[PDB]
């Protein structure tokens, strides 16, 4: 049928053929996880007024040290109206603006109070430098300055930065809309009771849940019968409604090739799990849709999803490096190597008294399944077997692909 594709070549070919989506304008509040499709420039200075860094008094530096009469106090949120004259001083708090007269601030720790209300007068013990302990206009952000670059993957801190500079509408890359479907005559919906010869569909739920975790919109195309007619109709719906189509479980490849006239890039990959993984592209009206045909085995489905689909989705949403994060960790258990590169869901746990994290296998289902109250947050990357190394022992360092919040 199809040539056997090496693990690396399959990955690179997915990323090379996956397009980067168009742009749209969104509100800054909904910008979480988005990638900027524009530079963002500040239209104000921050601060827009000279502000004290310390609690104390704003003084005229040329006055030097001595006794001064306190003419008032500058309160935050109100631009001061009084002017500090020689021999005068003004009480200031941190967030408060500097009055017209002063050019420096001396902190209260370096002053002594002289007269009190029935504060009236203070003695300045230090010679202030001009501009001392004051954040001048535009100290943090200057007008016209680019505060965020195009390509920035925005998190909460960036959202606040936009809020600061007053850029409430911003152009970003669209998120991919992902349609997911399952094929098979044995599949029933989870909501349904079992019938003879049938089982419940878990692949659809898992895949959708995985894509939702990354914040992408999804479309449930439900379970499709294993026949070209129902299969073609479902795909046409997926194409017309979504940017990505994912199916799990010979009829499929025929429809893509003969009916949709799509380009199937590979149909088998030298890996475990995930051997029958198929990836195809389809160009309709200058728009490229991509299709993932994942294996029917539930573990094979979720593993291949994180390896091929998730990085593809990240490139699509504008992430400059859609490649997954890979960390070094220790096996919690002994494992045998396969001629194929192998992958297992695992749980990463960091021990305060140990430099590297531990990886505990859970991909040994259907016999002994570790019931932990922690969800698997890692993808163990086991190497192909060699003449010398046939097995890896507890404690030895392997690659682990991070596949969730820790």
């Amino acid at each position: 049928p199809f040539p056997l594709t090496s693990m690396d070549k399959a990955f690179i070919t997915v990323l090379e053929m996956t397009p980067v989506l168009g742009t749209e304008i969104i509100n800054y509040r909904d910008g979480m996880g988005r990638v900027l499709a524009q530079d963002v420039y500040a239209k104000d200075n921050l601060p827009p007024f000279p502000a004290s860094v310390k609690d104390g008094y704003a003084v005229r530096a040329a006055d030097g040290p001595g006794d001064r009469f306190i003419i008032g106090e500058s309160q935050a949120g109100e631009q001061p109206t009084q002017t500090v004259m020689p021999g005068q001083v003004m009480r200031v708090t941190t967030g408060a603006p500097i009055p017209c007269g002063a050019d420096a601030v001396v902190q209260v720790e370096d002053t002594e109070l002289i007269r009190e209300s029935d504060e009236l007068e203070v003695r300045i013990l230090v010679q202030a430098r001009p501009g001392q302990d004051i954040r001048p206009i535009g100290h943090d952000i200057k007008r016209g300055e680019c505060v965020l670059a195009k390509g920035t993957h925005m998190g909460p801190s960036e959202i606040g930065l936009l809020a600061t500079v007053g850029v409430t509408e911003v152009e970003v890359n669209k998120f991919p809309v992902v349609a997911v479907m399952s094929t098979g005559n044995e599949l029933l919906n989870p909501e349904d009771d079992l019938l003879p010869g049938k089982i419940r569909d878990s692949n659809r739920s898992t895949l959708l849940a995985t894509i939702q975790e990354h914040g992408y919109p999804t479309i449930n195309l439900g379970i499709v019968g294993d026949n070209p007619d129902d299969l073609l109709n479902a795909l046409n719906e997926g194409i017309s409604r979504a940017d990505v189509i994912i199916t799990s479980g010979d009829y499929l490849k025929q429809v893509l090739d003969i009916d949709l006239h799509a380009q199937i890039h590979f149909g088998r990959v030298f890996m475990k799990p995930g051997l029958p993984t198929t990836f195809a592209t389809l160009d309709i009206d200058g728009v490229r849709k991509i299709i993932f045909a994942l294996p029917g085995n539930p573990v094979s489905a979720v593993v291949t999803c994180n390896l091929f689909v998730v990085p593809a989705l990240r490139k699509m949403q504008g992430i400059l490096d859609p490649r997954p994060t890979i960390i070094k960790a220790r096996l919690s258990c002994d494992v045998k190597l396969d001629p194929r590169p192998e992958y297992h869901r695992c749980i990463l746990t960091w021990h305060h008294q140990e430099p590297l994290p531990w990886a505990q296998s859970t991909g040994n289902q259907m016999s002994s399944r570790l019931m932990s109250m922690r969800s698997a947050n890692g993808l163990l990357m086991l190497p192909p077997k060699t003449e010398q190394y046939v097995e890896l022992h507890k404690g030895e360092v392997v690659d682990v692909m991070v596949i969730g919040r820790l």
Partner: peptide, 9 residues
């Protein structure tokens, strides 16, 4: 960068 496990001595 490769998504294949790397051996350690």
């Amino acid at each position: 960068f490769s998504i294949v496990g790397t051996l350690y001595p």
